[PDB]
């Protein structure tokens, strides 16, 4: 038993609701919850930009350090940082950019590292300003990850439109 509430199930593993994911990780202190992130760590905007702004910038602080020793990461990989006031962890998944020209296929890697955490809150990859189809991030998400995952998705009308068409 698990604090998540108001959550579609879809499947044994994978669950979905209509949420803000800041709103819905400040109420459960997940403790993972997954990051939009993009290589350099550049919390700009979507769901990077919403969750390092509801942590007073302390994302970025620690991004920057991340990044200043290690170098980028790989489209496709991922790393674990602190939540800060948001979670536990924060896993920072980069899914493929389509509006950079990034191969789709790297979607699955991208879902991969959810696997190493045994519960996760977490938007759909790629989706929103990085430019995939949320309905085929919503399968590969169902066909790749195996722990459980809760995802938040924070359009009403996108929402009702994954579970119409899950097959
Ligand atoms: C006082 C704090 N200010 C803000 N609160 C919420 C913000 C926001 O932009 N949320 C939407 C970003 N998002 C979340 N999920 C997705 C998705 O791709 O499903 C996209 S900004």
Redesign the pocket.
Known sequence: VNSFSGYLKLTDNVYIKNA???EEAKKVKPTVVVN?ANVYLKHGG??A??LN??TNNAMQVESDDYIATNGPLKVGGSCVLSGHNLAKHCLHVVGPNVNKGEDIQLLKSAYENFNQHEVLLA??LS??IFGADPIHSLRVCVDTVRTNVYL????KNLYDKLVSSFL
């Open positions: 803000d994911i800041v939009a979507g769901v930009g919403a702004k509801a938007p759909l989706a929103g938040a998705v924070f359009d």
